[PDB]
Write a protein that binds this ligand. Structure first.
Ligand SMILES: Cc1cc2nc3c(=O)[nH]c(=O)nc-3n(C[C@H](O)[C@H](O)[C@H](O)COP(=O)(O)OP(=O)(O)OC[C@H]3O[C@@H](n4cnc5c(N)ncnc54)[C@H](O)[C@@H]3O)c2cc1C
Ligand SMILES: Cc1cc2nc3c(=O)[nH]c(=O)nc-3n(C[C@H](O)[C@H](O)[C@H](O)COP(=O)(O)OP(=O)(O)OC[C@H]3O[C@@H](n4cnc5c(N)ncnc54)[C@H](O)[C@@H]3O)c2cc1C
Ligand SMILES: [Cl-]
Ligand SMILES: [Cl-]
Lengths: 431, 430
C-alpha cells in the first residue's frame, strides 16, 4: 500500500526532499513550473551541519555537492571576517572560525542538475505550474490543478515552491498578507571585479578571503570566485521607500548608483565599487518577517523551505534551514510508511496529518527565529553608530550576539529534532 | 582517480559495506567465493543497527523492511526468560526494547534485495581468495583467486566471515589467531506448527519469543511465517572437541535432542517431541579463545565475523558488523574528500591512517561483545537452575544480562564516528 507525495517546486529544497523520500521507497512526483534550470552561475555554501543532514537524507546528495564545487600542506579552516568599512583605519574587527569544511560551497545550478541526475528518471515534471489545490476528505487524495489544464492526485502535498509559494497562498488565502512576502527596505547591488583589481583596492589578504565591511545603514561583502580569478561583490543599502507591487525584484543598475551610497566610506571600499562593470544588478530583499506563517501545515498539506520561512540572506544559511525541514519531513513520512503498513486507508491518512502536525510543532520556532535573526544581524552590520566615534564600543559589542546567533545556526541538534518529531507523531496518533 | 576497495566476501556485512561505499562515490568490488546463496533462517537487528544501516544508505532499511513480513496500537518488542526445568515454568524476567526495538527479516531475501540495490557489476561470484600480495604502501594490493585470476585494488577489506582468509593472511595460517575455535556448545534447530506449539506451551508463550533457562542447556523459540510456525533452537553442552575439519552443520534426530532435555519440564519436552524426525545440529565456533591482536594493518582491514565472530547468544553479531561497516565507510569517505587533489603518497598514507583509526575505535567493543556472548550463555545455563534452594543466586544473573543487553542496544555510534575522524586526522600528522 504505497504512499505518494506531490512536491510543488523543483528547486534545491524540493529536489533534496524528493531524493530523501524516494531512497526510502516513497512514491514522489516533483512539479516544477519552469522549463529548466535557473540561477545560472550563482554560488552558495552549506554549513557542515547542513551537509550532515544531506548525508542522512541520501549520501549521494553529498557526492553531488562535492562534484559541483572546487597541493599538500594542511586542511584549510573556514573563517568569517568583519572589517570596518567606514573609517580609514579600515581595521579588522572580528573573526569566527567555522573549522575544517565548516562550510562547503558549490555552484547552485550545477548542484541542482547533479541532484536531478541522482533521482530516478521521471520524478521531476517541468512546465507544471500549480494553480489551485482541491482538498476533499482526509481519506481521499488531494488534487493538484496545473496551469496547463492537467491534474494530479496524491496522498499528500508538500509546498517547496519558494518565496512566492502558491501552496502557501492556498493555505492562508490569496488575499491574505500572510500569503505573501514583503520588503525588508534593503536592496543589494551585485557584480564582479577582477582579482587583480580587488588586490589594488584591498590588499592580497582581504582580496582572497571572505570579508564583510560594516558601517552606517549599509554593508558590503565580497569573496573570491572562478578559481580566485575574480571577486564577487554584494553591497546592501537602505531604502526608505516601498518596493512597488509588481515592480520586478531584480533590475539593472549602474556602478555609479552603487558608488553614491558609499561616498562617505573609506577609500579601499570605494575603489572596490569603482572596479565593477558599468552595468550591474539591483536585487530587492523580501522575506516572511512581517507576516510570519501561523502554521506550516494543515491537514495533508505542508510547507518547507522558503515557502515556509523565506529569510533575507544575512546569515547565508537559508537553504540550510530548508534542508533541516526536508530531513524532518522525510523521517516523519518514512515513519508513517512503516508504522501504518497493513492498516486501513483511514489510519494511513490520519497518520499523514499527524506527522505534518508534528513537523509544524517541531520546526516552526527555529525557522521563524531564523527569519527574525537574519534581519537582526543585518541591523548589527548596519548600525548608524559605526560612524559616530562616540559609540564605536557599543557598536563593536554586537559581535558576541553575532557569534551566538551564528553558533545557534551552525550547531543545530538535528538528532534531537528527529527524536522529538517521532514522539510528537506517536502522541498525535493517540499513543 | 577515485579510491578503489576490494571487499572479500559477499555476505550481509560485505554487501552492506559495499552499499555504503558506492553511495559515496567510492569504487567497490565484492569477491564472493560461492556461486550464487544464504540460508532460509530469520535474523533480527536492533533499532540501533537499523539507524546505522540508514546512515550507510537509506535503501538498506527499505530492503530490510521489504524483506520481512507485515505485522491496533503498535507492538513493543520484549525479551522474556522462563524457567525451563520445573513444571512451574515461571516467568523469570523480561526486557522491553520498545517499538521496533528489533526488526526481523529473512536472511536470504534481505541479501538478495541488497544486491539489487547495488549497481550492476559490483559483486563477482566464484572468486575465492587464495593469497594477498602486498607491496609498497603506494602500490595497489593484489588479490589472487583460486581460479588463477587476479584483482588490483587500492585497499582490501576482509568481510569473509568466521573462517576468513584475509584473517589468515594477517596472522599466518599456522597461528591459532587465524582460526575460530569451538565453544563446547551446539544447537538443535527445527520448526513445529503453531497449533503444536500452543498445545505444548500455551498460547501466550507459543506466540511470543521466550528463552527457557536451565542446567547446562537452554532453549529459545519464537513465531515465524506469520505465526503459523514456531522456530526452535536448543543449545546443549559438549565436553568433547569438535573434529577439526568435520562440518559445523550436520543432520540429527529429534530423539537425540529430546535426550538432552529428559529431566526438563513437560511442556518443553513436548515442543521437542513435535519437531520433525530429522533436524539439524549446529556447532558454535567463535573468536573468543584467540581474539585478533589488531583488526587492520597497512591497507588491509577486517570487518564483521572475520574480525570478531561470536556465538549467537545476544542475537546481535551482525549488528556489531554493521557498526563496523558504518565506521569504515565514514572513514574512507573522509579519506576521499580530504586527499582529493593530493599525491598518490598522501592518498595511500591516508588509507593506512584510516584503517589504523578503525582498529583503535572498534576493537575494544567488538572483542568485549565476543566475550559477552559466551558470558550470557553461561548465565542462561547455570547448573544452579537445577536446585530450587539456589534460586535466588540463579535469578540474580538478570541484572548483568540487562546491563550487557543495554550496552549493545544503546551504542553511541555518533561519538564513535567523531572519535574515528579525530584519530584519522591525528594519524595524518595533525
Ligand atoms: C543572494 C542570496 C544568496 C543566498 N546564499 C545562500 C547560501 O550560501 N547558503 C544557504 O543555505 N542559503 C542561501 N540563500 C537562501 C537560499 O537560496 C534559499 O533558502 C533556497 O533557494 C530555498 O530553496 P527552495 O527550494 O525552498 O526555494 P526556491 O529555490 O525558490 O525554489 C522554488 C521552486 O519552486 C518553483 N515554483 C514556484 N512556484 C511554483 C508553482 N506555482 N508551481 C510549480 N513550481 C513553482 C520555482 O520555479 C522554483 O524552482 C541565499 C539567498 C539569496 C537571495
Ligand atoms: C544461529 C545464528 C543466529 C544468528 N542470529 C542473528 C540475529 O538475529 N541478529 C544479528 O545481528 N546477528 C545474528 N547472528 C550473527 C550473524 O549471522 C553474523 O554476524 C553475520 O552473518 C556476519 O556476517 P559476515 O558478512 O561478516 O559473514 P558471513 O555471513 O559469514 O559472510 C561471509 C561471506 O564471505 C564468503 N567467503 C568466505 N571465505 C571466502 C573467501 N576465501 N573468498 C571469498 N569469499 C569468502 C563467504 O562465502 C560468505 O558469503 C547469528 C548467527 C548464528 C550462527
Ligand atoms: Cl540566506
Ligand atoms: Cl549473534
Amino acid at each position: 500500500q504505497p504512499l505518494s507525495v506531490g512536491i510543488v517546486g523543483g528547486g534545491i529544497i524540493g529536489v533534496i526532499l524528493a531524493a530523501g523520500l524516494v531512497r526510502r521507497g516513497i512514491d514522489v512526483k516533483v512539479f516544477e513550473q519552469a522549463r529548466g534550470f535557473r540561477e545560472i552561475g550563482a554560488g552558495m555554501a552549506f554549513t557542515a551541519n547542513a551537509v550532515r543532514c544531506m548525508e542522512m537524507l541520501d549520501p549521494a546528495i553529498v557526492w553531488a555537492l562535492r562534484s559541483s564545487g572546487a597541493d599538500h600542506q594542511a586542511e584549510a579552516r573556514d573563517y568569517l571576517r568583519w572589517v570596518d568599512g567606514y573609517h580609514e583605519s579600515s581595521k579588522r574587527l572580528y573573526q569566527l572560525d567555522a573549522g575544517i569544511r565548516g562550510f562547503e560551497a558549490c555552484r547552485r545550478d550545477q548542484f541542482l542538475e547533479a541532484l536531478v541526475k541522482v533521482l530516478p528518471e521521471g520524478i521531476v515534471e517541468c512546465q507544471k505550474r500549480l494553480q489551485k489545490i482541491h482538498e476533499k476528505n482526509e481519506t481521499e487524495k488531494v488534487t493538484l490543478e496545473f496551469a496547463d489544464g492537467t491534474f494530479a492526485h496524491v496522498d499528500c502535498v508538500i509546498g517547496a515552491d519558494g518565496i512566492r509559494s502558491r501552496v502557501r497562498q492556498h493555505l492562508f488565502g490569496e488575499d491574505s498578507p500572510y500569503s505573501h512576502p514583503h520588503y525588508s527596505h534593503k536592496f543589494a547591488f551585485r557584480g564582479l571585479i577582477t582579482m587583480e583589481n580587488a588586490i589594488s583596492a584591498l590588499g592580497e589578504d582581504k582580496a582572497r578571503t571572505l570579508n564583510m565591511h560594516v558601517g552606517p545603514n549599509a554593508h558590503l561583502i565580497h569573496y573570491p570566485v572562478a578559481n580566485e580569478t575574480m571577486v564577487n561583490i554584494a553591497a546592501f543599502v537602505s531604502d526608505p521607500e516601498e518596493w512597488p507591487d509588481k515592480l520586478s525584484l531584480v533590475g539593472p543598475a549602474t556602478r555609479e548608483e552603487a558608488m553614491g551610497y558609499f561616498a562617505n566610506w573609506n577609500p579601499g571600499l570605494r575603489a572596490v565599487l569603482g572596479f565593477m562593470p558599468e552595468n550591474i544588478d539591483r536585487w530587492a530583499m523580501f522575506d516572511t518577517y512581517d507576516y510570519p506563517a501561523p502554521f506550516f501545515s494543515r491537514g495533508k498539506i505542508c510547507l518547507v523551505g522558503d515557502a515556509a520561512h523565506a529569510a533575507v540572506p544575512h546569515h547565508g544559511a537559508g537553504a540550510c534551514i530548508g534542508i533541516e525541514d526536508a530531513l524532518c519531513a522525510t523521517v516523519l513520512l518514512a515513519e508513517v510508511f512503516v508504522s501504518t503498513r497493513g492498516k486501513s486507508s483511514i489510519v494511513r491518512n490520519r497518520a499523514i496529518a499527524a506527522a505534518f502536525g508534528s513537523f509544524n510543532a517541531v520546526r516552526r520556532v527555529r525557522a521563524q527565529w531564523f527569519v527574525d535573526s537574519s534581519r537582526r544581524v543585518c541591523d548589527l552590520y548596519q548600525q548608524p553608530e559605526w560612524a559616530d566615534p562616540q559609540k564605536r564600543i557599543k557598536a563593536e559589542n554586537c559581535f558576541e550576539e553575532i557569534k551566538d546567533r551564528s553558533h545557534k545556526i551552525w550547531h543545530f541538534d538535528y538528532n534531537s529534532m528527529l527524536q522529538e518529531a517521532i514522539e510528537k507523531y506517536r502522541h498525535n496518533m493517540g499513543s
